[PDB]
Design a protein around this ligand. Sequence first.
Ligand code: ZN
Lengths: 98, 101, 205, 19, 100, 251, 150, 206
Amino acid sequence: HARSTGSYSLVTQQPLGGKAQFGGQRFGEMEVWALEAYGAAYTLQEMLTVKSDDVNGRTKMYKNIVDGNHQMEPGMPESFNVLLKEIRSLGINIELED
Amino acid sequence: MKDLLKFLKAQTKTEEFDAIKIALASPDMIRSWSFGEVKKPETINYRTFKPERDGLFCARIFGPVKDYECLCGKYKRLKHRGVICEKCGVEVTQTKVRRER
Amino acid sequence: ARYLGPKLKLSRREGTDLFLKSGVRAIDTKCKIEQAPGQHGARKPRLSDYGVQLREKQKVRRIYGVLERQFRNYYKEAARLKGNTGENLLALLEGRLDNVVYRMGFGATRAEARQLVSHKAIMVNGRVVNIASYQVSPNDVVSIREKAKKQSRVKAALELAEQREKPTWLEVDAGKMEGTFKRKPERSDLSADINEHLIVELYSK
Amino acid sequence: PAGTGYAYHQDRMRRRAAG
Amino acid sequence: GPEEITADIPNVGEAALSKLDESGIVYIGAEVTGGDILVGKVTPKGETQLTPEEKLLRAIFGEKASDVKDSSLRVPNGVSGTVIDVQVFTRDGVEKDKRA
Amino acid sequence: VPLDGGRFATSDLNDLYRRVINRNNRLKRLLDLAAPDIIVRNEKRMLQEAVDALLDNGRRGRAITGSNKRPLKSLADMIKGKQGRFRQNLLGKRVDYSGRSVITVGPYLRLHQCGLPKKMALELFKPFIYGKLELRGLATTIKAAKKMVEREEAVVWDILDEVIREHPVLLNRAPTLHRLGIQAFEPVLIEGKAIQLHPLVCAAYNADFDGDQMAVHVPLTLEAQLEARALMMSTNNILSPANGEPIIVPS
Amino acid sequence: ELQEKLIAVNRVSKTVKGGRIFSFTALTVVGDGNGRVGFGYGKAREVPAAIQKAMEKARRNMINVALNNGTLQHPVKGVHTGSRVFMQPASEGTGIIAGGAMRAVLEVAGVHNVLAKAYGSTNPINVVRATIDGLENMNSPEMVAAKRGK
Amino acid sequence: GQKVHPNGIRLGIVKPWNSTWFANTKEFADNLDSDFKVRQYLTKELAKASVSRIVIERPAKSIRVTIHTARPGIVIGKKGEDVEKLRKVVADIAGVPAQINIAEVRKPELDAKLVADSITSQLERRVMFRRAMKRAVQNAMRLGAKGIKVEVSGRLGGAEIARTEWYREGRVPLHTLRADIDYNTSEAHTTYGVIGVKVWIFKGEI
RNA sequence: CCCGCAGAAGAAGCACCGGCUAACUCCGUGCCAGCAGCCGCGGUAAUACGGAGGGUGCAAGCGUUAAUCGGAAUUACUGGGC
Ligand SMILES: [Zn+2]
């Protein structure tokens, strides 16, 4: 199975499971340590922001490859913004200062 | 107006942050987030196929179903946007307001 | 006069749902808004430039239930009134008792609010008034005669008023029919996306 | 703040002193 | 209204209709691949209203009968294979498609 | 959650929120009616359990007994999935421009290389294929390039070879214990479904060819291509991280 | 966002050897409720094909008016061909007071309160530009201080 | 008139005969005759079958007959319906064991016949000629092909003055024998007059 | 002017619908009968005649006619031209 871009989930803007709607093939927490150990910050940043989580970041990144500019505009992942909303619903008052 | 408002949303979206604070939420602090108070336990009306007048899934509270249109009808397209309807009492421009509301 | 006849199609022609039949369901389905305002509805009704000024015109007109002549008069006054000619018109229609009553829980529709006023059922500043067009300046306290408060349809109208966004430019203790005119309604909060300008324009050549 | 990001984090930290 | 089993197929040429039978479902012996139609299409709900513009479009290109049509069943993208057997399970009341 | 596709059954949170709304409206009515001290205290006791179950279904008997939803799924359970919210937020989950296939030998390929599939390389480097055709002038626009890639013309594989010439692909095993597991290599074309991984690289990753999958990852942007080629490459990572001795050796 | 507006479209003909051919024209004005406009004029053997050209040609070759509070700084005055147009700014409340072309060119330039009049020829092809030239001259209350300040 | 049949003119090269067989003056007389009866009929009960051409092979007392159609299944029948009927109908009509093999039409938007019978049928459906004639036929350019010239006769729309229409894409060099083009007609007897149509699809060159 | 008593009871019509000008089809009629402010409609599928169905506008009024100003920057002082 292989996949570039397609379907996205409603709760947390992320790709589908795997071998049904969209071929995900999850990264996992252990693989982040392997990228951190080798020292690939830009490779780790795009994996958990640009080409996964960020809706605005993914749309901007797609146009960059087609035009032939590369680079990345990550921004906020959106999955982290859900954690702020879920924490907000359970009595806690979390908010981004400055 | 259309180009300026569209460009305003794109530029202002790219907003940074230094730190994240956490504390206890007050009755008024929760009231600051509040929109229109959930009354009924109903989700959606099965006759009309739409969110209930005032419940868990609502049009007036939270936001509408459509991208740039009212629940009843007469407040459609990218035009109007900022205004609120007379009948239901919901904003025209929303799309993804239900994600944050 | 008031046309009478039907009531739905009127809200179907203009497009959006007016306020001549308020309560349960309604609006979309059980009338079929934008389906066929008549015989030749769903087709290819090209627009104009004069109709866009006259259609929007009757829209805001048919709402408050006002005839042409009466409305025109509202505009003629909307001029002398120092300030934006556009808004003035609306504020003129809004301040109208006929609406002031409706907007205050009483009556489910301004058409019904009419009946109340006319039938001496409504009372302003302690005195009854049957003239809907009666101008309701600020501080004006509205209510219902102590001999008709616990009527039936009225006390019932305020029920859905719980859903209909309450007025901000006027207080009202729903308890014992206590309506008040806090202050002149500013377009900044006039339930409607009416394009008043299209009116003031149409009314000139 | 590790590897490639350590250079960006160190440069960004220096800017926080003045503004 | 009731969603029929095509017997027409909206917004498709002779290539799509050639594989399917007069019934609506796929014929016996047909190598399905890519995104071919397996079992019919069509939907009853439209709500367009008979306007002068819509009346001309309906007269020029009559979508079966009413002014509404969509889809039902197709072959998924990537997976491919021939047909060996087809089974129809009609409700106790509705009249028996052509292949049934 | 739709059962059929329009029915729309109430989710785990909606059942909990409905119980609080039903309890709040019921108690609020009793205060107006002026009910005795036994009922109003019992109604508040139900609201105490209803609000508690909505926020955190723990240290108390509550929720359904596995009718549809197995445990309860409160707001605390939504946050604390397994080890907090590490799977979605910390890890990333799914991630675009990735795939997976069965392992293979292929000794003909070099040390710093990998025999990637043809169909997978076309799908993984889809935006690069559109940009190449739009730049070269074969396709008029991205719509024509989308139709060309979907139709799968002969010219697509010619442009795909140039697109995957000097661009590494991050391969990885299922149990990524050490940094040596996740490694990059020069993606070579091959007529076959199974991915070809080098013999020397198999010792570091510890992946025996007996139905062992290996997930791929297309390195987008300019910075990650330089990072994968320099830091995460197979040729660069020769010696082991723990021990001084060579990782990639004869096995 | 750019707001196009179809002024009007005529047919026009052309007699030749065989017989006589026709080619609709159409004029279109485009702009935003900020202060930029620019009409367009294109022909074609098809009613829709025509407006297609005029629009394209419209988006380009625009202009930038020195608008103030949704109106003009002062009662400018422009003319072109046989069209004599005079525009005057009005306080908030008065809608766009104009006939055809003018009424349009302004309903896209960002004008909300005015009151013009076409004196010369009522030709849309001209009255449409006689207006644009007016605003194109509109001297804003700014810079004037610099034009003679020092 | 002043145009040679873009099909018959090429019947020699790049264009096969929709009825290849031998015969002598004797039976030839009634031969082409039956072919008409059978061919004319095969359309009557298979109009909506979306049938394109209809070849007719003839070895010896056993005509083949091939009904090319975009909609094969419908021309097949309930696992024997259509086939049986036709295959049997060719009884006394030819007084010989006549078979029948259906041919699937690939891309029903590039075949003249269809693109012609369609537009005409849409016209009968109370539809603006220009719209369908252009768009509802423009498709032949999206599924490939290089050039397609359409043509709608007169009496189009409310008018007593019959008028012909143009509308053509790509290139249709019907002045080239080595060009090969898909030409075919189609009528449409409406409330008034018989608005005709001619499809000229240029399917590649040589 | 107030209090009360019946009972939806006693109370809607006029012009128009080709364009200007807001509102469309089906019959019949066949340069006939007719329309008509202007351009023009009518000689077999008339959104223009007449009827009907529907729609638009205004309303105890509606429409026509008469007549002054407006449009007319078309006697131009503001404000034209040879
Ligand atoms: Zn609404």
